[PDB]
């Protein structure tokens, strides 16, 4: 039907406020939920309904700063939340040593991203520490882990690393040559990109791979025209009405962004069918509470609410800002970032 | 030991064994953002977890506490890491931990932390004996579980267990020839064993796929596999393929077949073939068939493809 914009604004507002104990499994990823809500409001041009200063302090309280002795550089970045019990400190005093306090690549990413969206200038971000922590996460094969203590490694984190380097406008945070190698090796026989070499190509990893290359400004340089054509084919074949993440899998609202954004980066999203996509996305809209779900007549959540909106954005929905398909923030915010980078260069 | 839902469950704040520890609360400052509300029990377990964690206490009581923390939230990666630290410090029976994680994963098969934990255990034990069967069970609740397939490929690669995978693949493809994950697994096995350069194998595979296509003509997965194993050798380098497909067109037609044909023709144009101008028309004719009636949803895409062939070979 139609886009219930105001309903979605209230939805995101509520998310920033309180969440039901049934979201406990997102505790360590609260910063990404904040991102979905904040970037979501930004996309609806409603950031005014929140206190940017309060939230900015909260975000900075999640930064793992280097200690006096700077012996924890390899562990700097951002925490997903305050779950470790470290005393609230909005990046004011120096780091308070803790055996298990370290950043999480997806949190450093969404954290910096949130700060930019809220208008902060990142002056309180220990850029060098973050970059040091990032470097520490990269593996021999070019991919990344989420935390220094160890975790699984795949394309998801390669994308996070890329976003971090891009926002801090400093690629010393990674060995780009190795990362690119990892991205190439993930291409499947069916031409999509998988989480890693040999794995099944997937819309999520394809986005992460392509977006990472675009952020490094090496898409053209890494893949040949013939290769890009094959990738484009794989991507555009994902549209059924809405988009699915893998051949023969049911469509899911969030893929309207994952795949849609990839198609946009590959400059062929324009050749997709907008109406069927828009119709599907809206069919998952919760007209009562707001937000979107992965499927119609399903419960909504921050992630699908955000990606459904970005999906609509890709098609320039009336009332939704243009989303930067590679950085996953509004173009308006991406622009403010360009200014930030310029200002630094002085 | 004492289950979280046991009638005799007791908060840690009320346990004698924990009297010496001051629980550490979580604080999100003056204005909490995206705050999750927690029950008395929940906050109790984690307030003590923070305490133990903060003091890096490698105790047996800490180990038991992680079990509760994990039952409350198996997505807390820090809890799992600490539990691994404890598994080592207390030299716990890893075979027992395997049973534990096996149960956990069955209840939460889409959790990243639990699969990572199991992989670490298997690395420690250097024992993959349970893996293939375990994964097969998980794949029974969801044959497309990305975590399961990822774990399965790691095990097979790490301990070189290729011997029976191709057979496992054949079995699953019979259960559901549309499972894209299985087709990927098939390519995984073959390319990591015999490879496709052996013309005997390539023929066996191309033949196998055509058979599956004949059973279910409308299956992107099968078509992607077929094109996948031939696209790099050169689709036009297989004259009998072009005709065998043109013969299917009548009955077993699908947008996948038409697209394949278009790709064949394009490969020909790419290799300065005979009748350049004629081939290009055969392609364009198909691109339009796709746009106008075969794969309408991609109408604009196909037209765009056509225009591309036009300005590339004229």
């Amino acid at each position: 039907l139609d886009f219930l914009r105001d309903r979605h604004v209230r939805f995101f507002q509520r998310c920033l406020q309180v969440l039901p104990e049934r979201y406990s499994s997102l505790e360590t990823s609260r910063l990404t939920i904040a991102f979905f809500a904040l970037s979501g409001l930004d996309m609806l041009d409603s950031l005014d309904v929140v206190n940017k200063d309060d939230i900015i302090e909260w975000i900075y309280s999640l930064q793992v700063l280097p200690t006096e002795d700077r012996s924890n550089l390899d562990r700097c970045g951002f925490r997903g939340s305050s779950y470790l019990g470290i005393p609230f400190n909005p990046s004011k005093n120096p780091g308070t040593a803790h055996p298990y306090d370290s950043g999480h690549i997806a949190m450093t990413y969404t954290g910096l991203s949130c700060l930019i969206i809220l208008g902060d200038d990142l002056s309180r971000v220990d850029k060098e520490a973050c970059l040091a922590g990032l470097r520490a996460l990269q593996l021999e094969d070019g991919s990344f882990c989420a935390v220094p203590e160890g975790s699984e490694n795949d394309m998801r984190f390669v994308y996070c690393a890329s976003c971090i380097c891009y926002m801090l406008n400093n690629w010393s945070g990674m060995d780009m040559k190795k990362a690119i190698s990892y991205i190439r090796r993930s291409m499947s026989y069916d031409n999509g990109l998988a989480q890693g070499a040999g794995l099944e190509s997937h819309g999520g990893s394809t986005f992460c791979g392509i977006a990472s290359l675009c952020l490094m400004g090496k898409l053209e340089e890494v893949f040949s025209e013939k290769e890009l054509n094959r990738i484009k084919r794989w991507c555009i074949m994902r549209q059924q009405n809405g988009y699915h993440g893998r051949p023969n899998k049911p469509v899911d609202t969030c893929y309207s962004f994952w795949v849609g954004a990839t198609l946009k980066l590959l400059k062929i999203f324009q050749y997709t069918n907008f109406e069927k996509n828009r119709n599907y996305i809206l069919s998952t809209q919760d007209r009562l509470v707001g937000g979107f779900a992965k499927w119609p007549d399903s419960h909504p959540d921050a992630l699908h609410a955000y990606f459904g909106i970005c999906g609509l954005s890709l098609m320039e929905e009336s009332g939704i800002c243009k989303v930067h398909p590679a950085l996953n923030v509004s173009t308006r915010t991406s622009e403010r970032l360009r200014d930030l980078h310029q200002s630094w260069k002085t | 030991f004492l289950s979280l839902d046991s009638p005799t469950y007791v908060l840690y704040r009320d346990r004698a064994e924990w009297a010496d520890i001051d629980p550490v609360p979580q604080n999100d400052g003056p204005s909490p953002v995206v705050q999750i509300i927690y029950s008395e029990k929940f906050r109790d377990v984690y307030d003590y977890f923070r305490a133990v964690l903060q003091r890096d206490e490698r105790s047996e009581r800490a180990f038991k506490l992680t079990r509760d923390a994990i039952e409350l939230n198996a997505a807390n990666y820090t809890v799992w890491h600490f539990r691994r630290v404890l598994l080592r410090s207390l030299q716990k029976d890893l075979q027992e931990e395997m049973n534990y994680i096996i149960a956990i994963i069955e209840e939460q098969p889409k959790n990243y932390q639990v699969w990572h934990h199991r992989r670490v255990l298997v690395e420690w034990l250097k024992d993959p004996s349970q893996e293939l069967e375990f994964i097969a069970d998980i794949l029974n609740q969801d044959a497309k579980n990305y975590h399961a397939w990822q774990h399965r490929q790691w095990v097979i690669q790490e301990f070189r267990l290729w011997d029976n995978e191709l057979q496992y693949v054949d079995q699953l493809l019979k259960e559901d020839v549309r499972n894209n994950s299985v087709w990927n697994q098939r390519h995984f096995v073959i390319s990591n064993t015999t490879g496709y350069s052996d013309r005997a194998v390539l023929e066996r595979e191309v033949q196998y796929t055509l058979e599956m296509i004949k059973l279910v003509p409308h299956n992107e997965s099968a078509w992607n596999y077929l094109k996948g194993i031939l696209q790099d050798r050169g689709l036009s380098r297989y004259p009998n393929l072009l005709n065998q497909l043109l013969d299917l067109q009548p009955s077993h037609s699908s947008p996948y077949l038409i697209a394949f044909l278009v790709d064949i023709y394009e490969d020909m144009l790419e290799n300065q073939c005979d009748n350049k101008e004629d081939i290009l028309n055969k392609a364009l004719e198909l691109c339009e068939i796709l746009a106008k009636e075969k794969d309408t949803i991609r109408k604009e895409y196909w037209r765009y493809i056509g225009r591309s062939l036009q300005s590339k070979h004229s």
Partner: peptide
């Protein structure tokens, strides 16, 4: 729903 972490 989708646990991406």
């Amino acid at each position: 729903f989708c646990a991406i972490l």
